[PDB]
Amino acid sequence: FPEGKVLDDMEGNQWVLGKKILIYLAFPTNKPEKDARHVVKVEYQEGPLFSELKFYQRVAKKDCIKKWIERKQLDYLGIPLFYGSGLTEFKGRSYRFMVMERLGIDLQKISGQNGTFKKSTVLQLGIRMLDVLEYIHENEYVHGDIKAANLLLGYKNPDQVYLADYGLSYRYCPNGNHKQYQENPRKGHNGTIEFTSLDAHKGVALSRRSDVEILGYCMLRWLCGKLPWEQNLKDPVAVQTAKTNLLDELPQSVLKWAPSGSSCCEIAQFLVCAHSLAYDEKPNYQALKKILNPHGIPLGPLDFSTKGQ
Ligand SMILES: [Mg+2]
């Protein structure tokens, strides 16, 4: 798509495409380029963008997010804001597009030695992810794919972290009707194999516990530099049995995995809590957050320093 192309969203706002970063910078045709706080995401009418679109339209509403933030006394919530969407024509083909808040670099790009982060940063990231999970879960959605590549630093505030890429997102409780539990080995082992939940491995529709579980595996990976199933990633059944063994052997499976300079006591207890959840059970988000911050230290800046590496 050429820079300068004007897109018309369903609301009737007009947007001018900037340079590619497909994701492009976007400007409103009303304001000046100096004030560029938007990106446009473009795909054909052929899947994951439409999956993201249903999520962002239903959940990433500025005013509700604002009121939630005020009520729950959050400094922020790591959900990128949605501005509009629609279709544009390129030749004969139609493309779907979505205008979102511009964000910064992903965490996989900025990770230290062996995809690790400092323990305080790992624990803060999980707390920030728990705030997002509570919000999306309350709005009937699970993410399914938490990982460093899908965590992004802000643009307007580069010190805030966001959960992005709702391509594998799932509406688990449409209009209050929680999905039933059904194993389906024809739909087995979707997600990022390293981090995907046991329910995903079994072909079971994703529910709230799966996101908490995935977040636990992520924190473990970020802190320790590897997961026990690191050598088995091309064998999803081996990965499934490894994660099952890890959860069955809690807390020691996780406690013992940690290096001497970064305890896994918090992540061990987090996963003990996660593993106690029934399929349709609401996570106790407040308890999980206190588990990650057992001394109630106020959240500082995210430390991505690679001093010494
Ligand atoms: Mg299959």
Residue numbers in the entry: 15 to 35, 42 to 66, 68 to 330
Article passage:
VRK3 is a pseudokinase member of the vaccinia related kinase (VRK) family, which also includes two active vertebrate paralogs (VRK1 and VRK2), one or two orthologs in all metazoans, and an ortholog in most poxviruses, including the founding member, vaccinia virus B1R (Boyle and Traktman, 2004; Manning et al., 2002a, 2002b; Nezu et al., 1997; Nichols and Traktman, 2004; Vega et al., 2003). The VRK family is part of the CK1 kinase group, which displays distinctive alterations to some motifs conserved in almost all other kinases, but still assumes the standard kinase fold. We present here the crystal structure of the VRK3 kinase domain, the first solved pseudokinase, along with that of its active paralog, VRK2.
VRK2 also phosphorylates p53 and BAF (Blanco et al., 2006; Nichols et al., 2006). VRK2 has two splice forms that localize either to the nucleus and cytoplasm or to the ER and mitochondria (Blanco et al., 2006). VRK2 is also well structured, except for the ATP-binding glycine-rich loop (G-loop, G36-G41) and N67 in the loop linking β3 to αC. The unstructured G-loop is commonly seen in kinase structures without bound ATP. In contrast, the VRK3 G-loop is well ordered, with low B-values that indicate that it is rigid in the absence of ATP. Both kinase structures are in an active conformation: the two lobes of the kinase domain are closed, αC is rotated inwards, and a key ion pair between K72-E91PKA is formed. The overall structures of VRK3 and VRK2 are similar and superimpose with an RMSD of 2.3 Å, using 291 main-chain positions. In the C-terminal lobe, two helices are shortened in VRK2 relative to VRK3 and CK1: αD is truncated, containing only a half a helical turn, and αI is shortened and loses its distinctive kink. In VRK2, residues 206–208 form a short 3-10 helix, with the charged R207 facing out to the solvent, opening a groove through the middle of the activation loop that might participate in substrate binding. T213 is found in most serine/threonine kinases, anchoring the loop and organizing the active site via hydrogen bonds to D166 and K168VRK2 in the hrDxkxxN catalytic loop motif (Nolen et al., 2004). T217VRK2 forms a hydrogen bond to the backbone of N211VRK2 to help stabilize the position of the activation segment, and thus its loss in VRK3 may reflect the change in conformation of this segment.
